[PDB]
Amino acid sequence: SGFRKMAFPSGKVEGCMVQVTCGTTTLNGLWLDDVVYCPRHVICTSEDMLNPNYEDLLIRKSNHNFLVQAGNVQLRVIGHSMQNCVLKLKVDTANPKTPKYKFVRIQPGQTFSVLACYNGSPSGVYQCAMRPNFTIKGSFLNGSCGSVGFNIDCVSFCYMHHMELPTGVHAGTDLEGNFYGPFVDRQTAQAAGTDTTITVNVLAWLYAAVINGDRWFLNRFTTTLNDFNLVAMKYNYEPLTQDHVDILGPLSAQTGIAVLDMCASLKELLQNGMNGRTILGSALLEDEFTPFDVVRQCSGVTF
Amino acid sequence: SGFRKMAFPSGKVEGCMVQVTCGTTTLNGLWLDDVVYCPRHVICTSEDMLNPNYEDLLIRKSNHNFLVQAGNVQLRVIGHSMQNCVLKLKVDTANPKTPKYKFVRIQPGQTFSVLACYNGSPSGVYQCAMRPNFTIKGSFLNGSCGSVGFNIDYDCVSFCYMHHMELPTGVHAGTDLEGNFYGPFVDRQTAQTDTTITVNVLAWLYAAVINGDRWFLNRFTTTLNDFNLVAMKYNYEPLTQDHVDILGPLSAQTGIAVLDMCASLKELLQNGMNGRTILGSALLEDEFTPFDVVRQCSGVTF
Numbered sequence: 186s187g188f189r190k191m192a193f194p195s196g197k198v199e200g201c202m203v204q205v206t207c208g209t210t211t212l213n214g215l216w217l218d219d220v221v222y223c224p225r226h227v228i229c230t231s232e233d234m235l236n237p238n239y240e241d242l243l244i245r246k247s248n249h250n251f252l253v254q255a256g257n258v259q260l261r262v263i264g265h266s267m268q269n270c271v272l273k274l275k276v277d278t279a280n281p282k283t284p285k286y287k288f289v290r291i292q293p294g295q296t297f298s299v300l301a302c303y304n305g306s307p308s309g310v311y312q313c314a315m316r317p318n319f320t321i322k323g324s325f326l327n328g329s330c331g332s333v334g335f336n337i338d339c340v341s342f343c344y345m346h347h348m349e350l351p352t353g354v355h356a357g358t359d360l361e362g363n364f365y366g367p368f369v370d371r372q373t374a375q376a377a378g379t380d381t382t383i384t385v386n387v388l389a390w391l392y393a394a395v396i397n398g399d400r401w402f403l404n405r406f407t408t409t410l411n412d413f414n415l416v417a418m419k420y421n422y423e424p425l426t427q428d429h430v431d432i433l434g435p436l437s438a439q440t441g442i443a444v445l446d447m448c449a450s451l452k453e454l455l456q457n458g459m460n461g462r463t464i465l466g467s468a469l470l471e472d473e474f475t476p477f478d479v480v481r482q483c484s485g486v487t488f
Numbered sequence: 489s490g491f492r493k494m495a496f497p498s499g500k501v502e503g504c505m506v507q508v509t510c511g512t513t514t515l516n517g518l519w520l521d522d523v524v525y526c527p528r529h530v531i532c533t534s535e536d537m538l539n540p541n542y543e544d545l546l547i548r549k550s551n552h553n554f555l556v557q558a559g560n561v562q563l564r565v566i567g568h569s570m571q572n573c574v575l576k577l578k579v580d581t582a583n584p585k586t587p588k589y590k591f592v593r594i595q596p597g598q599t600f601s602v603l604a605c606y607n608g609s610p611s612g613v614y615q616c617a618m619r620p621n622f623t624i625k626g627s628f629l630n631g632s633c634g635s636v637g638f639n640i641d642y643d644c645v646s647f648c649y650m651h652h653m654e655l656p657t658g659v660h661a662g663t664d665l666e667g668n669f670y671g672p673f674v675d676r677q678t679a680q681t682d683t684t685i686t687v688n689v690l691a692w693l694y695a696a697v698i699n700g701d702r703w704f705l706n707r708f709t710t711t712l713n714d715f716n717l718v719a720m721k722y723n724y725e726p727l728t729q730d731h732v733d734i735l736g737p738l739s740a741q742t743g744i745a746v747l748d749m750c751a752s753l754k755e756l757l758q759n760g761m762n763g764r765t766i767l768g769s770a771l772l773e774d775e776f777t778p779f780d781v782v783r784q785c786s787g788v789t790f
């Protein structure tokens with residue numbers, strides 16, 4: 186019993202982290218097979234950062250301009266190319282620690298683990314969700330760029346870190362270099378959209394609470410999907426779809442609480458508040474656990 | 489910026505986890521050099537459990553009764569002994585992934601990362617505190633026994649917890665790696681008050697300030713004695729001068745004296761948060777030490 190924000194074990198990703206230096210800038214790279222992936226902004230001088238023309242700047246670089254270090258070993262760069270906002274440095278050695286891996290672009294609400302790194306070395310691991318506004322609420326300092334987010338299914342990499350937006354939230358790309366959200370890699374203040382609560386995840390966590398015997402909030406009513414969403418909207422919650430209802434099905438079967446019944450209990454929590462009570466030790470409704478995250482933790486799924 | 493409950497990178501510990509089966513019981517072991525450490529209750533049967541005579545039960549086991557699996561390799565057990573509540577299975581192969589390590593016994597209020605494992609395989613990692621009542625508020629299912637807690641400093645893993653049991657309230661109990669339980673608990677089948685870690689709450693308020701969440705700051709100061717009068721009423725541990733000293737680094741970094749911050753905590757205790765949050769929480773958080781805050785906010789690596 187118990188319910189914690191649980192990250193994936195990080196060892197498989199630790200073995201892939203390297204340091205990449207261009208000029209005055211050092212950040213992290215991801216070494217898989219004979220390629221090192223990192224943010225393309227590594228190539229900017231401080232002046233370049235204001236309005237970079239990355240294609241032009243890259244033409245001026247040579248392979249030797251990229252200093253890639255795996256621990257105490259310098260890797261020899263033999264080619265360089267850019268894919269969207271990610272730089273791909275071909276090296277003459279394949280990483281012997283490369284796990285089975287894939288690159289995935291995740292949807293809002295999906296969670297992942299971040300291995301925060303500086304100078305190619307790990308600082309810590311924590312669980313993040315992709316917010317509906319395409320930011321993540323991470324813990325990233327200058328130097329952390331190139332740190333990645335991942336799931337273990339095969340390691341599925343979904344996020345590479347590029348920048349910190351004005352609200353102290355974080356923005357980055359998938360491993361094909363496409364930003365999540367409308368953001369661009371230029372040194373200017375960029376506003377995130379208004380964020381919302383990930384409803385399907387709140388429902389998942391209420392199921393985790395029931396599994397753990399914390400069930401005071403269960404009421405005796407039901408609701409339709411439409412009537413639930415009419416309330417959700419008023420409290421800045423995302424719409425719940427029928428696909429979400431189906432995804433929550435196995436948790437509904439395990440607990441005996443139909444999804445629409447759980448929605449009626451959530452509706453009451455939204456309308457009346459929690460009145461000083463906690464659920465799974467929290468005084469707020471938690472939205473950074475997906476339905477799979479709940480099953481993973483409550484059933485002991487391993488890797 | 490940003491502040492998260494961040495666990496240590498777990499790779500060095502993952503390379504030490506093995507599966508240990510005795511009879512019908514499977515749990516995890518920690519393989520360092522040529523010894524596998526695991527809870528001694530692995531040797532109990534369902535009848536053995538009310539008052540197990542572990543010395544006798546261990547004598548009656550063969551090395552052959554312990555099936556130790558490191559991935560897809562069975563390790564040959566060549567000896568079995570016990571140190572307090574930990575079983576030590578000597579194996580004929582030294583773990584080539586053994587990190588630099590120490591066994592440490594931590595104090596209440598200190599934190600560590602747990603690598604939760606099942607069948608010798610890592611499932612997840614999370615940070616938690618040793619409570620003042622010597623339990624941990626973990627996430628552990630049947631089969632997780634032998635999972636460990638640890639801290640890292642540079643290249644050295646300090647193992648501090650091995651998991652043995654879940655108490656009726658759903659919190660968790662275990663030993664150090666010398667086999668001594670934290671708290672009054674015992675490894676037998678029988679039925680077996682906490683406080684808030686004030687210095688950690690203060691550390692986390694400093695973390696909030698460092699990360700720009702400043703609304704709860706006020707212009708007032710308090711004496712240590714006046715603060716503790718309030719603290720005690722809310723079931724907070726007394727703040728000692730030693731605690732004030734340990735908050736020195738964070739006080740210097742923010743420019744906010746400890747007794748200034750204490751007045752902000754006093755107001756939060758007496759008046760609540762008025763619908764606001766601090767670092768995303770609607771409760772005061774006590775599972776970050778002063779060192780944890782400095783580590784995370786300065787980007788310390790391993």
Ligand SMILES: *[C@H](O)[C@H](Cc1ccc[nH]c1=O)NC(=O)[C@H](CC1CCCCC1)NC(=O)c1cc2ccccc2[nH]1
Binds near residue numbers: 234325
């Ligand atoms: C990469 O290591 C670093 C990550 C970082 C820095 C500071 C705080 N948290 C962090 O995670 N990223 C930057 O420093 C980044 C570099 C810049 C990105 C666009 C292309 C050119 C290089 N810059 C920012 O994150 C940044 C710039 C800026 C300007 C106005 C407001 C906010 C802001 N954030």
Ligand SMILES: *[C@H](O)[C@H](Cc1ccc[nH]c1=O)NC(=O)[C@H](CC1CCCCC1)NC(=O)c1cc2ccccc2[nH]1
Binds near residue numbers: 537629630632652655
């Ligand atoms: C070891 O893998 C397992 C850990 C566990 C089990 C269930 C839930 N969460 C967990 O972390 N430990 C046990 O199953 C343990 C065995 C027992 C330890 C003392 C010596 C003899 C063997 N039993 C418990 O943790 C346990 C039994 C029990 C009965 C009533 C209420 C609570 C309770 N906890």
Ligand code: NA
Binds near residue numbers: 708752
């Ligand atoms: Na104050």
